[PDB]
Scaffold this active site. Structure first.
Site, short mmCIF file in Angstrom:
data_model
loop_
_atom_site.label_atom_id
_atom_site.label_comp_id
_atom_site.label_asym_id
_atom_site.label_seq_id
_atom_site.Cartn_x
_atom_site.Cartn_y
_atom_site.Cartn_z
CG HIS A 7 -1.57 1.37 1.46
ND1 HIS A 7 -2.47 1.93 0.57
CD2 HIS A 7 -1.52 2.22 2.52
CE1 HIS A 7 -2.93 3.07 1.12
NE2 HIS A 7 -2.39 3.29 2.30
CG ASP A 62 11.53 18.70 -24.18
OD1 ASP A 62 12.15 17.76 -23.63
OD2 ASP A 62 10.36 18.56 -24.58
CD1 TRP A 79 6.23 2.74 5.34
CD2 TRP A 79 7.59 3.57 3.78
NE1 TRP A 79 6.56 4.02 5.72
CE2 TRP A 79 7.40 4.55 4.77
CE3 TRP A 79 8.41 3.86 2.69
CZ2 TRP A 79 8.00 5.82 4.70
CZ3 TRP A 79 9.00 5.12 2.62
CH2 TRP A 79 8.79 6.08 3.62
CB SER A 102 13.42 6.42 -12.01
OG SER A 102 12.42 7.40 -12.24
CB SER A 103 13.37 9.66 -8.19
OG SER A 103 12.00 9.37 -8.43
CG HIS A 125 11.93 14.27 8.08
ND1 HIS A 125 10.71 14.04 8.65
CD2 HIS A 125 11.89 15.45 7.43
CE1 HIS A 125 9.96 15.07 8.29
NE2 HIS A 125 10.62 15.93 7.54
CD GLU A 136 9.94 10.08 -0.63
OE1 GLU A 136 8.88 9.73 -1.18
OE2 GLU A 136 10.87 10.64 -1.24
CE1 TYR A 171 8.39 18.65 6.44
CE2 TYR A 171 9.91 16.88 6.94
CZ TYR A 171 8.96 17.78 7.35
OH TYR A 171 8.55 17.77 8.65
CB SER A 204 1.58 28.73 -4.22
OG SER A 204 1.99 28.62 -2.87
CG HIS A 260 11.08 13.42 13.67
ND1 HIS A 260 11.16 14.65 13.05
CD2 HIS A 260 10.62 12.57 12.71
CE1 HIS A 260 10.76 14.50 11.77
NE2 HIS A 260 10.42 13.25 11.50
CG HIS A 261 10.96 9.16 11.49
ND1 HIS A 261 9.64 9.27 11.13
CD2 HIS A 261 11.57 10.28 11.02
CE1 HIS A 261 9.50 10.45 10.50
NE2 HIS A 261 10.65 11.10 10.42
CB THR A 284 5.24 24.69 7.89
OG1 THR A 284 6.48 23.98 7.73
CG2 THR A 284 4.19 23.95 7.10
CE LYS A 315 4.67 26.98 0.75
NZ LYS A 315 5.29 28.04 -0.08
NE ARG A 359 2.36 2.83 11.79
CZ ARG A 359 3.43 3.29 11.13
NH1 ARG A 359 4.35 4.00 11.77
NH2 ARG A 359 3.58 3.02 9.84
C1 HEA Z 1 0.40 9.13 0.23
C2 HEA Z 1 0.22 7.81 0.36
C3 HEA Z 1 -0.95 7.24 1.06
C4 HEA Z 1 -2.25 7.50 0.84
C5 HEA Z 1 -2.84 8.53 -0.09
C6 HEA Z 1 -2.97 6.66 1.74
C7 HEA Z 1 -4.29 6.38 1.61
C8 HEA Z 1 -4.93 5.40 2.25
N1 HEA Z 1 -4.37 4.67 3.23
FE1 HEA Z 1 -2.52 4.49 3.85
N2 HEA Z 1 -0.73 4.33 4.31
C9 HEA Z 1 0.39 4.86 3.65
C10 HEA Z 1 0.32 5.81 2.63
C11 HEA Z 1 -0.86 6.33 2.13
N3 HEA Z 1 -2.12 5.94 2.55
C12 HEA Z 1 1.65 4.44 4.30
C13 HEA Z 1 3.06 4.90 4.02
C14 HEA Z 1 1.28 3.66 5.35
C15 HEA Z 1 2.17 2.99 6.39
C16 HEA Z 1 2.78 1.70 5.84
C17 HEA Z 1 3.54 0.90 6.90
O1 HEA Z 1 3.20 1.01 8.10
O2 HEA Z 1 4.46 0.14 6.52
C18 HEA Z 1 -0.16 3.62 5.33
C19 HEA Z 1 -0.85 2.90 6.23
C20 HEA Z 1 -2.19 2.80 6.19
C21 HEA Z 1 -2.94 2.17 7.25
C22 HEA Z 1 -2.43 1.53 8.54
C23 HEA Z 1 -2.12 0.04 8.32
C24 HEA Z 1 -1.70 -0.69 9.59
O3 HEA Z 1 -1.12 -0.06 10.50
O4 HEA Z 1 -1.96 -1.90 9.69
C25 HEA Z 1 -4.23 2.32 6.87
C26 HEA Z 1 -5.33 1.78 7.49
O5 HEA Z 1 -6.28 2.49 7.73
C27 HEA Z 1 -4.25 3.11 5.66
C28 HEA Z 1 -5.40 3.51 5.05
C29 HEA Z 1 -5.44 4.19 3.88
C30 HEA Z 1 -6.65 4.54 3.27
C31 HEA Z 1 -8.04 4.09 3.63
C32 HEA Z 1 -6.33 5.31 2.28
C33 HEA Z 1 -7.39 5.94 1.54
O6 HEA Z 1 -7.63 7.27 2.02
C34 HEA Z 1 -7.16 5.91 0.03
C35 HEA Z 1 -8.27 6.58 -0.76
C36 HEA Z 1 -7.77 6.61 -2.20
C37 HEA Z 1 -7.09 7.62 -2.79
C38 HEA Z 1 -7.05 8.95 -2.03
C39 HEA Z 1 -6.35 7.42 -4.14
C40 HEA Z 1 -6.29 8.72 -4.93
C41 HEA Z 1 -5.17 8.93 -5.97
C42 HEA Z 1 -5.21 8.41 -7.20
C43 HEA Z 1 -5.96 7.08 -7.31
C44 HEA Z 1 -4.59 9.07 -8.48
C45 HEA Z 1 -5.77 9.21 -9.45
C46 HEA Z 1 -5.51 9.67 -10.86
C47 HEA Z 1 -5.25 10.94 -11.19
C48 HEA Z 1 -5.84 12.16 -10.48
C49 HEA Z 1 -4.21 11.21 -12.25
N4 HEA Z 1 -2.99 3.40 5.24
C1 HEA Z 2 3.39 14.44 3.60
C2 HEA Z 2 4.39 13.97 4.33
C3 HEA Z 2 4.53 14.41 5.74
C4 HEA Z 2 4.72 15.67 6.23
C5 HEA Z 2 4.91 16.92 5.38
C6 HEA Z 2 4.94 15.60 7.66
C7 HEA Z 2 5.17 16.68 8.47
C8 HEA Z 2 5.57 16.51 9.77
N1 HEA Z 2 5.75 15.30 10.44
FE1 HEA Z 2 5.53 13.50 9.81
N2 HEA Z 2 5.15 11.95 9.21
C9 HEA Z 2 4.85 11.53 7.93
C10 HEA Z 2 4.60 12.28 6.84
C11 HEA Z 2 4.67 13.58 6.90
N3 HEA Z 2 4.99 14.27 8.07
C12 HEA Z 2 4.81 10.11 7.77
C13 HEA Z 2 4.63 9.35 6.46
C14 HEA Z 2 5.01 9.60 8.99
C15 HEA Z 2 5.06 8.12 9.36
C16 HEA Z 2 6.28 7.44 8.81
C17 HEA Z 2 6.28 5.94 9.04
O1 HEA Z 2 6.43 5.53 10.21
O2 HEA Z 2 6.17 5.17 8.05
C18 HEA Z 2 5.25 10.72 9.86
C19 HEA Z 2 5.83 10.51 11.08
C20 HEA Z 2 6.25 11.54 11.86
C21 HEA Z 2 6.96 11.40 13.13
C22 HEA Z 2 7.32 10.04 13.77
C23 HEA Z 2 6.26 9.61 14.81
C24 HEA Z 2 6.41 8.15 15.26
O3 HEA Z 2 6.62 7.28 14.39
O4 HEA Z 2 6.30 7.87 16.47
C25 HEA Z 2 7.07 12.66 13.65
C26 HEA Z 2 7.94 13.03 14.69
O5 HEA Z 2 7.99 14.13 15.22
C27 HEA Z 2 6.32 13.52 12.68
C28 HEA Z 2 6.29 14.88 12.72
C29 HEA Z 2 6.09 15.71 11.67
C30 HEA Z 2 6.16 17.11 11.80
C31 HEA Z 2 6.50 17.93 13.03
C32 HEA Z 2 5.84 17.62 10.62
C33 HEA Z 2 5.89 19.06 10.29
O6 HEA Z 2 6.53 19.28 9.04
C34 HEA Z 2 4.54 19.75 10.20
C35 HEA Z 2 4.66 21.25 10.13
C36 HEA Z 2 3.27 21.88 9.97
C37 HEA Z 2 2.63 22.66 10.87
C38 HEA Z 2 3.14 22.96 12.27
C39 HEA Z 2 1.26 23.24 10.55
C40 HEA Z 2 1.15 24.70 10.11
C41 HEA Z 2 1.57 25.72 11.14
C42 HEA Z 2 0.83 26.73 11.60
C43 HEA Z 2 -0.61 27.04 11.23
C44 HEA Z 2 1.55 27.64 12.52
C45 HEA Z 2 1.51 27.32 14.03
C46 HEA Z 2 2.13 26.03 14.71
C47 HEA Z 2 2.41 25.89 16.06
C48 HEA Z 2 2.82 27.12 16.82
C49 HEA Z 2 2.29 24.61 16.88
N4 HEA Z 2 5.97 12.84 11.53
CU CU Z 3 9.78 12.66 9.66
#
Ligand code: HEA
Ligand code: HEA
Ligand code: CU
Ligand code: TGL
Ligand code: PEK
Ligand code: PEK
Ligand code: PSC
Ligand code: PGV
Ligand code: PGV
Ligand code: PGV
Ligand code: DMU
Ligand code: DMU
Ligand code: CHD
Ligand code: CHD
Ligand code: CUA
Ligand code: MG
Ligand code: NA
Ligand code: ZN
Ligand code: ZN
Ligand code: ZN
Ligand code: ZN
Ligand code: ZN
Ligand code: ZN
Lengths: 84, 227, 58, 259, 46, 98, 79, 43, 514
Positions: free
Chosen positions: I61, I91, I126, I156-157, I240, I242, I244, I255, I290-291, I316, I319, I438
């Site tokens: 997933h 291009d 993952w 690729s990337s 991390h 990634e 971002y 924007s 932080h992970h 953040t 923005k 989880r």
């Molecule tokens: C950005 C990636 C992404 C997205 C969008 C989602 C979407 C969904 N994911 Fe999740 N999910 C992950 C990334 C994502 N997830 C990851 C990284 C984990 C953790 C893996 C791990 O622990 O190892 C996770 C884990 C995870 C769990 C926890 C599993 C566990 O702990 O056992 C669950 C369960 O609720 C879940 C649910 C869902 C659901 C219901 C959606 C739904 O909201 C999905 C609804 C469908 C969409 C929003 C698809 C839309 C996009 C398109 C289809 C493109 C379409 C075409 C064009 C526009 C060109 N996801």
């Molecule tokens: C889209 C990708 C995305 C983004 C951008 C972020 C953004 C952030 N994530 Fe992360 N994060 C994930 C995807 C993302 N994360 C994923 C995938 C995981 C699970 C990974 C895995 O286990 O597989 C995760 C896991 C994860 C962890 C690990 C937790 C754990 O496993 O126990 C933590 C740790 O601090 C965290 C924190 C943050 C923080 C602080 C931000 C910050 O960047 C957010 C900053 C934004 C704001 C703060 C909001 C706007 C601010 C305002 C309106 C101003 C005022 C704010 C204050 C004064 C409080 N994230």
């Molecule tokens: Cu992180």
């Protein structure tokens, strides 16, 4: 540093050739001399079935799966010790 | 343990988890406030016919909305750190118990005096006694002395696992070759549950942790009898 | 050796509407076919292999 | 029909053949590791070789022969190589992170010491020192080659380039011997692990860099390089330096400080 | 030169809306279906 | 210690790079490599925008250090003005390739 | 004698969550102190401290394994 | 944005067809595998 | 002629189109997987089997949604389509290598599907952490194929990143400074840099994991002096950045969209937005641990990472407020894209605030590995990244296709997905706090209520995704060709009509230095 020489008025091809033949290559001459001196086959140490070396979690994809890639009988023992 | 339809945290059993709760409460307030503020403002921008599409000056208001969130993060980090230093605090334990994760069960070792050790498995759904919790019961609970500072050492003998006990605020990873320390201290007697918190294979969902917090005395008797 | 770059510039600019990877002559064609053949053939083979490994042989 | 300096590339099959050869290599490896068969790997390597050969033959064609490499196009190719190199660096940084982690906090299974018990390091003042001088020497000889090319001196550019190449080869041979004479293997724990992988990868880059240089040599032979337009050589040189510097880091970290 | 304009800049044809519906159906369907058949496949090995 | 045998750009440059090199020797800019210097952009002294068809896109950075660029097609004919600052731009068509 | 041991106390030489070294240290300290006393004609009663401490901290299997190794003659540590 | 009237108008009837066909391409293959789930676990 | 254009391409538009197709297909796969997940957790007890098959699903997933859906769409798609046009380039800098970046993904995907086919698949999460991912607890080809898949996706990337940077640097109109390029172009570059730097590391790490598994190395095996924790560092070092990398292009699109439908000629505080994106990209490289709050690290270290991670909130925050300021006093066009954008602004804030909650290593102890984490990341991914992709898609669809979509049908798709995703993920905040771990195929009975509601929301989202496909067909079936498009003065990508010709900007724009 500045080294211990001088030139720099102009760093062009003649200069770099000069360095090649009057420093670089001689360096490699000495180091080859030194190397082909301190060589000689050093007495292979006593084997000890240490558990942190000669690791084998999966057979190697070549040979009988038990010899390292660049295996040298004279110095590389198998998990069970030196070869015949 | 958790009850049906639960919203917040499982009730605090240790003073540390009592600390986290109060901290999470001031933190969450900010989270609500900000998220609702944004929402309101989003609505505010969208509810008027008045317009101003010419250029708007930036360097003056960026001081406002940089310094503000800035001051807020600090109002979350401060209590967050003092509490973090707290959990590390030197405390001097009365006992020391080791736990080791295995695919898929927890083994325990109380070796201060005697050489006491035992495996602890999840009671299958099919062998549960009336009133017993599905997936949460174990055959051999971790008997421990209530109101006493204990030292838990966590490790594992195969893959990674993680020892968790929500009610007391504990989670330490069980890493093979490593010995992770963490301190336990229940303010009350009773049964306290947790679940393996690190994917460890086929039965990761099925290898819980139960702690039996009784008074020192009974603990001793139990140790002895457990020989 | 002698500088023959001009001969090569002419050959490669010779307006025959050919894409640069075939503009060198008949050889280019051959090399390309070998390559493409191997790639596609090998790709099929791999698909075969994924299939084979997808099922147990107990 | 166009009024800008850029290069519009004729549709090509290489990106595909390349993407495909990648698929065959990765598969070929899985086939070998688990189902003991090189067949896939074989083809994969072969197509990869053909792809690279043709893909770069064409780029030579497009520049030396068709004159598509305007300054803007060359400027872009410079950023491209520098950027590639950076990623390559970060890649190595991975292995350096590993080695440093393992050697700074040795675990009880090694004996809580570095090098671990049972490990007998190569003398850093023997062949390793020699390799060090060889690569430094090539760095000089390649610089002479560059300044010769820029001064339009063909004979000397060739001379310098040849030497540079001979040195890289020599390093490769020395390393091959050292790999053999080594009392430790890749299977000898984290030491043998971090060692052969890092130096193993570096050795590979040495071969690549040498190959690249070899190519530049022959292109020089056929007069492709002008005293002012010779980016293919410029890159091979930049790469070579990167290789040279990585080795310096290895020598200091693994062979010297780590023995 | 390549065809330019609406419905010409794509690899699939949009000539017939029905042939297209089928096209899109096989495309998007094949993808969605895949996990299921894999799951199925894994359950059927043991 | 010295000699030759290495072609120069003048002798070997071919294709588009040669054209650029030649045109660059004559102080010309056929392949739009330099940034054109602005006139006073008045009705009388418009900005002469070269071209090879009946229109070309103009990007107007109204004031120095503006981050937003105003874009529009400049058509052959009457001089047109930037929708933003109103400076004048006039197309001055064809040739390039003789 | 100067004992009345409840459990290994806080060691300022190992103040973090990782205790791997703490255990390992004390396990080495004992078997070293033990080999000195068995050698020079003295009593192993002095190395008691380390024995209790290592025992309290070290996973049975680690101890079990390290012991199997000192016997097999393949213990990596210096004793 | 402004656009020209549909070159090949899709009447409500046609749309219903589209929509349905769409949902079915998703729902059927899955519904199938999901149905014979039990037949799979132990077979 | 078909092959030459689609298999041998060197056109940035075509390649972006290919990426957009791949990304859409992959989205279907990933949505399927997401349903299989929520189905299992639908009601108590086991549905599919134990945690192995379950986790093979959860793993894929993630890989699919990330590497095959979000990245290919945002970068290979909107990137290759929009970037050149936004800077008036003919291009990409290496239009041929750009093609290879694309053709790597299918083999990359193929390998991923192949790992779930052979043996028992790779039910490792993952993050592929060893030793569970090792050749012992996960013997067989499975994990090895997942690795190679990452490699191809990686190569690729990386190449893709090089192209976008070279391009964004070298190929702008001579008079245009970097501070005159559109925000989306900026965001793409910054993202390309994180990729450049972070990816090689992940490559080194998984390569060490491969050898440990087939060459008897022991980088992560204690028996040989290794450490499983090292892999974690290497992984998260990339991990991390990634995350971002997955949201920056989104920030870019947001924007543009908010500006566009606010009826503004420019986004509020341009320079501020550039600063912000660069800060984030930066700080995203020094916060990976932080992970790892529970693997037990020094308290000083855990103190640092807590502090550092929290700082990201400042840039953040800028923005977000800027986006609101752009809406400020605009002539609001309540189009679909605007709705997705407004959606995104709010939802993303929530997922970020919770991100900040998790930043406290204290609190993370109890929340780590629970569903609170899942709530946080699904709010910024399945609501952040996803919403942005949606908005971008509806907005620029006209430009890519030449046709228009049915706005009402689009507003419907929005309403459904909105309800779906929230109902899906909001309840997971409760499960997280109440201790649900989880990667669990089954759970204690008390967690039954919320897990059922969650699974239901995931179904509405399914309805939504199917609808979208339909809406797409509808626009392609009706053929409402595009006539006029407002605001072209400040949206250069649209200036060559919809769809623009194969060859655009053959004759460079004219920009006065002054
Ligand atoms: C950005 C990636 C992404 C997205 C969008 C989602 C979407 C969904 N994911 Fe999740 N999910 C992950 C990334 C994502 N997830 C990851 C990284 C984990 C953790 C893996 C791990 O622990 O190892 C996770 C884990 C995870 C769990 C926890 C599993 C566990 O702990 O056992 C669950 C369960 O609720 C879940 C649910 C869902 C659901 C219901 C959606 C739904 O909201 C999905 C609804 C469908 C969409 C929003 C698809 C839309 C996009 C398109 C289809 C493109 C379409 C075409 C064009 C526009 C060109 N996801
Ligand atoms: C889209 C990708 C995305 C983004 C951008 C972020 C953004 C952030 N994530 Fe992360 N994060 C994930 C995807 C993302 N994360 C994923 C995938 C995981 C699970 C990974 C895995 O286990 O597989 C995760 C896991 C994860 C962890 C690990 C937790 C754990 O496993 O126990 C933590 C740790 O601090 C965290 C924190 C943050 C923080 C602080 C931000 C910050 O960047 C957010 C900053 C934004 C704001 C703060 C909001 C706007 C601010 C305002 C309106 C101003 C005022 C704010 C204050 C004064 C409080 N994230
Ligand atoms: Cu992180
Ligand atoms: C779907 C199931 C809902 C179940 C509801 C509760 C039942 C209570 C019974 C009975 C209630 C009374 C008895 C028990 C009291 C327990 C107190 C406790 O232990 O306290 C801690 C608990 C409970 O917290 C609460 O005290 C509940 C808070 C609920 C906030 C809901 C906002 C909902 C918006 C729309 C509906 C939801 C879906 C969309 C959500 C969209 C994102 C918010 O745990 C939390 O921290 C949960 C939240 C985690 C963080 C999310 C932060 C941002 C959320 C919303 C910002 C919106 C702003 C604008 C305003 C909102 C605009 C839309
Ligand atoms: C002569 C100096 C130059 C070194 C390279 C030359 C020949 C080896 C073949 C390929 C090597 C290329 C990269 C290095 C990969 C693994 C480390 C190999 C370094 C080396 O060659 O180490 C050797 C081990 O050989 C082994 O197992 C090697 C087994 C060979 C199979 C290679 C395994 C392929 C795995 C490659 C993974 C590819 C992923 C890379 C991705 C890049 C970014 C995506 C050491 O021999 P040993 O007997 O253990 O000790 C010697 C005792 N007398
Ligand atoms: C313990 C660790 C162990 C592992 C270590 C292993 C190895 C060590 C590391 C390195 C050594 C290796 C090789 C060095 C030899 C040659 C490299 C090539 C450099 C060169 O020769 O560069 C030249 C000039 O400088 C230029 O590029 C300057 C312009 C650069 C442009 C590319 C960069 C763009 C990418 C993003 C921009 C960064 C932004 C900075 C601000 C951010 C703030 C936070 C070529 O010209 P050009 O591109 O046309 O530019 C025009 C500007 N004059
Ligand atoms: C942790 C959370 C933090 C919370 C955030 C707090 C938000 C800040 C609240 C208020 C900001 C006050 C700014 C004051 C600026 C004056 C507004 C005005 O009136 O706008 C212009 C000023 O230009 C200018 O600054 C340009 C136009 C206005 C510049 C500022 C407008 C943007 C403000 C933000 C929009 C709302 C988003 C808030 C974000 C949370 C008008 O110009 P003049 O009168 O010269 O000319 C007109 C001709 N006369 C002379 C005949 C009248
Ligand atoms: C760089 C400039 C910015 C400066 C800020 C500082 C940041 C990094 C540099 C510092 C590295 C050296 C510090 C070492 C000192 C401690 C020694 C030690 O022992 O640390 C060790 C690991 O260090 C290790 O590999 C450390 C391995 C490296 C990790 C750092 C990652 C950054 C790398 C990427 C940057 C790219 C640069 C491009 C290169 C040209 C092990 O960890 P401990 O927790 O002790 O475990 C022992 C337990 O039994 C007791 O608790
Ligand atoms: C046993 C050996 C097999 C091992 C596998 C790999 C084998 C060999 C790799 C060696 C690289 C060969 C590259 C040769 C490139 C020749 C084409 C060339 O050099 O093209 C030049 C452009 O540079 C360009 O594209 C620059 C092109 C950049 C290519 C360099 C990339 C290195 C590849 C590394 C691949 C592995 C990565 C690491 C693995 C972990 C042409 O421009 P000029 O020279 O100015 O000409 C014009 C003048 O004549 C005008 O008057
Ligand atoms: C487990 C095994 C995994 C195996 C994965 C293998 C993946 C692919 C294998 C097949 C790929 C090799 C085929 C040759 C590729 C050459 C690309 C090249 O040389 O690209 C050049 C651009 O990059 C430049 O210069 C500078 C950049 C040069 C890049 C060279 C490509 C090497 C690919 C490997 C990269 C590894 C990543 C390194 C970090 C770990 C040319 O740009 P084009 O658009 O072509 O032309 C533009 C025209 O103006 C030229 O006249
Ligand atoms: C998470 C994504 C999935 C969403 C839920 C699926 C939505 C509904 C799908 C309907 O699909 C089916 O329904 C059936 C039952 O109504 C089946 O018929 C079956 O059941 C029968 C009737 O009860 C029989 O006639 C046949 O043998 C047959 O196998 C079956 O084939 C299947 O295609
Ligand atoms: C990212 C870039 C890196 C890509 C991957 C690198 C590819 C490395 C190729 C290694 O392949 C080989 O494999 C073999 C194993 O099959 C060998 O034969 C050997 O192995 C045997 C087969 O069991 C024996 O019959 C022999 O003695 C012999 O040494 C061997 O010579 C060698 O060519
Ligand atoms: C033939 C050519 C002179 C220029 C020309 O091609 O006309 C000469 C001059 C310098 C070159 C040589 C250099 O003097 C360096 C090398 C020295 C020799 O010992 C072996 C071959 C060697 C690798 C070269 C071969 C030779 O054929 C070259 C290529
Ligand atoms: C100086 C620089 C560029 C200005 C320009 O050339 O237009 C601008 C862009 C973004 C600004 C930064 C952002 O506004 C964020 C911060 C806001 C506070 O008001 C001051 C510092 C602060 C960190 C700013 C300092 C400065 O005015 C910055 C950095
Ligand atoms: Cu133990 Cu999961
Ligand atoms: Mg964890
Ligand atoms: Na279940
Ligand atoms: Zn044309
Ligand atoms: Zn030239
Ligand atoms: Zn040069
Ligand atoms: Zn203007
Ligand atoms: Zn033994
Ligand atoms: Zn054309």
């Amino acid at each position: 540093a500045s080294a211990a020489k001088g030139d720099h008025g102009g760093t062009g091809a003649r200069t770099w050739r000069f360095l090649t033949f009057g420093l670089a290559l001689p360096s490699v001459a000495l180091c080859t001399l030194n190397s082909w001196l301190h060589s000689g086959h050093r007495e292979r140490p006593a084997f000890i079935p240490y558990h942190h070396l000669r690791i084998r979690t999966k057979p190697f994809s070549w040979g009988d799966g038990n010899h390292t890639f660049f295996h040298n009988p004279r110095v590389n023992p198998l998990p069970t010790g030196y070869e015949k | 343990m958790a009850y049906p339809m639960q919203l917040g945290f499982q009730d605090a059993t240790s003073p540390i988890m009592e600390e986290l709760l109060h901290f999470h409460d001031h933190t969450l307030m900010i989270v609500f406030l900000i998220s609702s503020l944004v929402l309101y403002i989003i609505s505010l921008m969208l509810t008027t016919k008045l317009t101003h599409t010419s250029t708007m000056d930036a360097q003056e208001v960026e001081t406002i909305w940089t310094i503000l969130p800035a001051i807020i993060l600090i109002l979350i980090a401060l209590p967050s750190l003092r509490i973090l230093y707290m959990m590390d605090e030197i405390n001097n334990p009365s006992l020391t118990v080791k736990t080791m994760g295995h695919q898929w069960y927890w083994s325990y070792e109380y070796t201060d005096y005697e050489d006491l050790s035992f495996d602890s498995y999840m009671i299958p759904t099919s062998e549960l006694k009336p009133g017993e919790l599905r997936l949460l019961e174990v055959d051999n609970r971790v008997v421990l002395p209530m109101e006493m500072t204990i030292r838990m050492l966590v490790s594992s003998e195969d893959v990674l696992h993680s020892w968790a006990v929500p009610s007391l605020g504990l989670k330490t990873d069980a890493i093979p070759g490593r010995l992770n320390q963490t301190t336990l201290m229940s303010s009350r007697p009773g049964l306290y549950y947790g679940q393996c918190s690190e994917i460890c294979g086929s039965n990761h969902s099925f290898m819980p942790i139960v702690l039996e917090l009784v008074p020192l005395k009974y603990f001793e008797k139990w140790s002895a009898s457990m020989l | 050796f002698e500088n023959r770059v001009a001969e090569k510039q002419k050959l490669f600019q010779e307006d025959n509407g050919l894409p640069v990877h075939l503009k060198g002559g008949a050889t280019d064609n051959i090399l390309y076919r070998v390559t493409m053949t191997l790639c596609l053939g090998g790709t099929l083979y791999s698909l075969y292999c994924l299939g084979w490994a997808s099922f147990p042989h107990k | 029909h166009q009024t800008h300096a850029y290069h519009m590339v004729n549709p090509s099959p290489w990106p595909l053949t390349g993407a495909l050869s990648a698929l065959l290599m990765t598969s070929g490896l899985t086939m070998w590791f688990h189902f003991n068969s090189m067949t896939l790997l074989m083809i994969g390597l072969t197509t990869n070789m053909l792809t690279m050969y043709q893909w770069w033959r064409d780029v030579i064609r497009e520049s030396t022969f068709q004159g598509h490499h305007t300054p803007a196009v060359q400027k872009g190719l410079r950023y491209g190589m520098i950027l590639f190199i950076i990623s390559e660096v970060l890649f190595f940084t991975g292995f350096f992170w590993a080695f440093y982690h393992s050697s700074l906090a040795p675990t009880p299974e090694l004996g809580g010491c570095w090098p671990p018990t049972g490990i007998h390091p190569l003398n850093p003042l023997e062949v390793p020192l020699l390799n060090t001088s060889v690569l430094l020497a090539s760095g000089v000889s390649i610089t002479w080659a560059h300044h010769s090319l820029m001064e339009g001196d063909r004979k000397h550019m060739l001379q310098a380039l040849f030497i540079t190449i001979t040195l890289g080869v020599y390093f490769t041979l020395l390393q091959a011997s050292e790999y053999y004479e080594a009392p430790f293997t890749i299977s000898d724990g984290v030491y043998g692990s971090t060692f052969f992988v890092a130096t193993g990868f570096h050795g590979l880059h040495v071969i690549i860099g040498s190959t690249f240089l070899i190519v530049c040599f022959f292109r020089q032979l056929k007069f492709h390089f002008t005293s002012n337009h010779h980016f293919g050589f410029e890159a091979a040189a930049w790469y070579w330096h990167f290789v040279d510097v990585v080795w310096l880091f290895l020598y200091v970290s693994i062979y010297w400080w780590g023995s | 030169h390549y065809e330019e304009g609406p419905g010409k800049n794509i690899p699939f044809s949009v000539e017939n809306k029905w042939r297209l519906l089928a096209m899109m159906t096989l495309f998007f369907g094949s993808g969605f279906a895949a996990p299921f058949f894999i799951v199925r496949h894994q359950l059927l090995k043991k | 210690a010295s000699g030759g045998g290495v072609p120069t750009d003048e002798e070997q440059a071919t294709g588009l790079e040669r054209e650029v090199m030649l045109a660059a020797r004559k102080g010309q800019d056929p392949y739009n490599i330099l940034a054109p210097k602005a006139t006073s952009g008045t009705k009388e002294d418009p900005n002469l925008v070269p071209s090879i068809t009946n229109k070309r896109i103009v990007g107007c950075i109204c004031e120095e250090d503006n981050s937003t660029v105003i874009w529009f097609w400049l058509h052959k004919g009457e001089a047109q003005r930037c929708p933003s600052c109103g400076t004048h731009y006039k197309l001055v068509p064809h040739q390039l390739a003789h | 004698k100067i004992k009345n041991y409840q459990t290994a106390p806080f060691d300022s030489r190992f103040p973090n969550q990782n205790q791997t070294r703490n255990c390992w240290q004390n396990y080495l300290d004992f078997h070293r102190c033990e080999k000195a006393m068995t050698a020079k004609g003295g009593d192993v009663s002095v190395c008691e401290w380390y024995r209790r401490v290592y025992k309290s901290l070290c996973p049975i299997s680690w101890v079990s394994t390290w012991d199997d190794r000192r016997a097999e003659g393949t213990f990596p540590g210096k004793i | 944005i402004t656009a020209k009237p549909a070159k090949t108008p899709t009447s409500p009837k046609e749309q219903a067809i589209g929509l349905s066909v769409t949902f079915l391409s998703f729902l059927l293959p899955a519904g199938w595998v999901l149905y014979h789930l039990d037949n799979y676990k132990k077979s | 002629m078909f092959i030459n254009r689609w298999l041998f391409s060197t056109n940035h538009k075509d390649i972006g189109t290919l990426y957009l197709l791949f990304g859409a297909w992959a989205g279907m796969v990933g949505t399927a997987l997401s349903l299989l997940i929520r189905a299992e957790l639908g009601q108590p007890g086991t549905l599919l089997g134990d945690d192995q098959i379950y986790n093979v699903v959860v793993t894929a997933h993630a890989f699919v949604m990330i590497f095959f859906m979000v990245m290919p769409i945002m970068i290979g798609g909107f990137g290759n389509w929009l970037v050149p046009l936004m800077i008036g380039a003919p291009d990409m800098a290496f239009p041929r290598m750009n093609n290879m970046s694309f053709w790597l993904l299918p083999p990359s995907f193929l390998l991923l599907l192949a790992s779930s086919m052979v043996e028992a698949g790779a039910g490792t999460g993952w993050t592929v952490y060893p030793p569970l991912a090792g050749n012992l607890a996960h013997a067989g080809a499975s994990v090895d194929l997942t690795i190679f898949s990452l490699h191809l996706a990686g190569v690729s990337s990386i190449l893709g990143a090089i192209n976008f940077i070279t391009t964004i640097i070298n190929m702008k109109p001579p008079a245009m400074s970097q501070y005159q390029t559109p925000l989306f172009v900026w965001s793409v570059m910054i993202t390309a840099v994180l990729l450049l730097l972070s990816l090689p590391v992940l490559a080194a790490g998984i390569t060490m994991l491969l050898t440990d598994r087939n060459l008897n190395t022991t980088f992560f095996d204690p028996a040989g002096g290794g450490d499983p924790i090292l892999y974690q560092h290497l992984f998260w070092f990339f991990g991390h950045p990634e995350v971002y990398i997955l949201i920056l292009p989104g920030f870019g699109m947001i924007s543009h969209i908010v500006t566009y439908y606010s009826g503004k000629k420019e986004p509020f505080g341009y320079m501020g937005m550039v600063w912000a994106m660069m800060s984030i990209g930066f700080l995203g490289f020094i916060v990976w641990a932080h992970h790892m709050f529970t693997v037990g690290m020094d308290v000083d270290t855990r103190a640092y990472f807590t502090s550092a991670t929290m700082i990201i909130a400042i840039p953040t925050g800028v923005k977000v407020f800027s986006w609101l300021a752009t809406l400020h006093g605009g002539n609001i066009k309540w189009s679909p894209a605007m709705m997705w954008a407004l959606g995104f602004i709010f939802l993303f804030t929530v997922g970020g605030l919770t991100g900040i909650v998790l930043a406290n290593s204290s609190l993370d102890i109890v929340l780590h590995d629970t569903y609170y984490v899942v709530a946080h990341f699904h709010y910024v991914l399945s609501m952040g990244a996803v919403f942005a992709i949606m908005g971008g898609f509806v907005h620029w669809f006209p430009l890519f296709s030449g046709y228009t979509l049915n706005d009402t049908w689009a507003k419907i798709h929005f309403a459904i997905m909105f309800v779906g995703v929230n109902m899906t993920f909001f309840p997971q905040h409760f499960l997280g706090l109440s201790g649900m771990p989880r990667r669990y195929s089954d759970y204690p009975d008390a967690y039954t209520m919320w897990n059922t509601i969650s699974s239901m929301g995931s179904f509405i989202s399914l309805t939504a995704v199917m609808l979208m496909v339909f809406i797409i067909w509808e626009a392609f079936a009706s053929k409402r060709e595009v006539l006029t498009v407002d605001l072209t003065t400040t949206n250069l990508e649209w200036l060559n009509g919809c769809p623009p010709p194969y060859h655009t900007f053959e004759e460079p724009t004219y920009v006065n230095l002054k």
